[PDB]
Scaffold this active site. Sequence first.
Site, short mmCIF file in Angstrom:
data_model
loop_
_atom_site.label_atom_id
_atom_site.label_comp_id
_atom_site.label_asym_id
_atom_site.label_seq_id
_atom_site.Cartn_x
_atom_site.Cartn_y
_atom_site.Cartn_z
N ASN A 139 7.77 108.51 43.82
CA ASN A 139 8.48 109.55 43.08
C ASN A 139 9.21 109.01 41.85
O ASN A 139 10.09 109.69 41.31
CB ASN A 139 9.44 110.27 44.01
CG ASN A 139 8.72 111.09 45.03
OD1 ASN A 139 7.73 111.71 44.69
ND2 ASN A 139 9.18 111.07 46.28
N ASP A 152 10.35 113.88 40.75
CA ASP A 152 10.28 114.65 42.00
C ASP A 152 11.51 115.54 42.15
O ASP A 152 12.33 115.38 43.06
CB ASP A 152 10.12 113.73 43.22
CG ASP A 152 9.79 114.50 44.49
OD1 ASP A 152 8.61 114.91 44.67
OD2 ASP A 152 10.70 114.69 45.33
C1 LIG Z 1 7.39 118.11 36.42
N1 LIG Z 1 6.07 117.82 36.94
C2 LIG Z 1 5.03 118.12 35.95
C3 LIG Z 1 5.95 116.49 37.55
C4 LIG Z 1 7.28 115.98 38.03
O1 LIG Z 1 7.54 116.24 39.29
C5 LIG Z 1 8.09 115.26 37.21
C6 LIG Z 1 9.56 115.49 37.15
N2 LIG Z 1 10.11 116.19 35.98
O2 LIG Z 1 10.29 115.13 38.06
C7 LIG Z 1 7.48 114.31 36.35
O3 LIG Z 1 8.01 113.24 36.04
C8 LIG Z 1 6.15 114.73 35.65
O4 LIG Z 1 6.71 115.63 34.72
C9 LIG Z 1 5.39 113.70 34.86
O5 LIG Z 1 6.05 113.24 33.80
C10 LIG Z 1 4.14 113.27 35.20
C11 LIG Z 1 3.39 112.32 34.41
O6 LIG Z 1 3.63 112.09 33.18
C12 LIG Z 1 2.43 111.48 35.09
C13 LIG Z 1 1.83 110.46 34.35
O7 LIG Z 1 2.08 110.34 33.04
C14 LIG Z 1 0.93 109.59 34.94
C15 LIG Z 1 0.64 109.72 36.26
C16 LIG Z 1 1.25 110.71 37.02
CL1 LIG Z 1 0.84 110.79 38.70
C17 LIG Z 1 2.15 111.59 36.46
C18 LIG Z 1 2.75 112.72 37.29
C19 LIG Z 1 1.62 113.48 37.98
O8 LIG Z 1 3.54 112.26 38.39
C20 LIG Z 1 3.46 113.80 36.45
C21 LIG Z 1 4.41 114.53 37.37
C22 LIG Z 1 5.25 115.51 36.59
#
Ligand SMILES: CN(C)[C@@H]1C(O)=C(C(N)=O)C(=O)[C@@]2(O)C(O)=C3C(=O)c4c(O)ccc(Cl)c4[C@@](C)(O)[C@H]3C[C@@H]12
Length: 257
Positions: A139, A152
């Site tokens: 997370n 998360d």
């Molecule tokens: C808001 N939501 C879109 C996601 C999330 O839970 C976030 C948050 N604001 O706590 C993220 O950091 C995220 O907004 C966020 O920044 C993500 C992201 O950039 C990302 C990247 O760049 C590379 C691999 C992965 Cl697995 C992820 C990723 C899927 O975890 C996403 C998650 C999202």
Amino acid sequence: AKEIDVSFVKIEEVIGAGEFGEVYKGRLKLPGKREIYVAIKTLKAGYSEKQRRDFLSEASIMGQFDHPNIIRLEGVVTKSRPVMIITEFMENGALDSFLRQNDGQFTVIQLVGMLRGIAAGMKYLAEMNYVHRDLAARNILVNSNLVCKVSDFIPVRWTAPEAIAYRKFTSASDVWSYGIVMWEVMSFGERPYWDMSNQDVINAIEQDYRLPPPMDCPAALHQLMLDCWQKDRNSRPRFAEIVNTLDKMIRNPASLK
Ligand SMILES: CN(C)[C@@H]1C(O)=C(C(N)=O)C(=O)[C@@]2(O)C(O)=C3C(=O)c4c(O)ccc(Cl)c4[C@@](C)(O)[C@H]3C[C@@H]12
């Protein structure tokens, strides 16, 4: 909660299927401003109005936070359908997979810098009276410059004993979780307690078992893990003391052996 016109967003590759829905890598180009990469979170197709509200309430919470180690909310798409949450893009993804895919490829002091950033974001969250409850390397996200950011916004082996036994979730149970994150980071993404069953973990922790130092982990860093894992939640360091201890290790690298 800044409203973003969907016409300023270009949605590129999928980079995940979260629980609420899909996440995409995209580009955000606001008029007169330099284009940036963003993560675009969508709600699963067919969402109800209740799920929509739940989704946008998550966004409302993220928008309160402004810290270098907390994922930045760029804005929301709510005027058009589907709704979307637009956050900063983190090129290196989740911290656990990032370390598992780069085993041994970062120095101890780089790893301590990552841990310091996480502790600073957690200090900020606790100061604002938010309990994460789900703090784990999976997370945490990592940008191109290795800056780690808390995201998360019951995982038994990441959870404090009081949180499991009495559902008492506090910033002190987040500190327990943070100690598990330290161990994941210094082990380059090993699984906490490996193949132990959830009940095995609970029983072992109650008998004063704690995880051993990861290979080549500095003794001082493993001691800080053990401080985070004190049975009595009031004996654990607060995130302010964790940041100060990690700073002092960074400022005094002889401390790392
Ligand atoms: C808001 N939501 C879109 C996601 C999330 O839970 C976030 C948050 N604001 O706590 C993220 O950091 C995220 O907004 C966020 O920044 C993500 C992201 O950039 C990302 C990247 O760049 C590379 C691999 C992965 Cl697995 C992820 C990723 C899927 O975890 C996403 C998650 C999202």
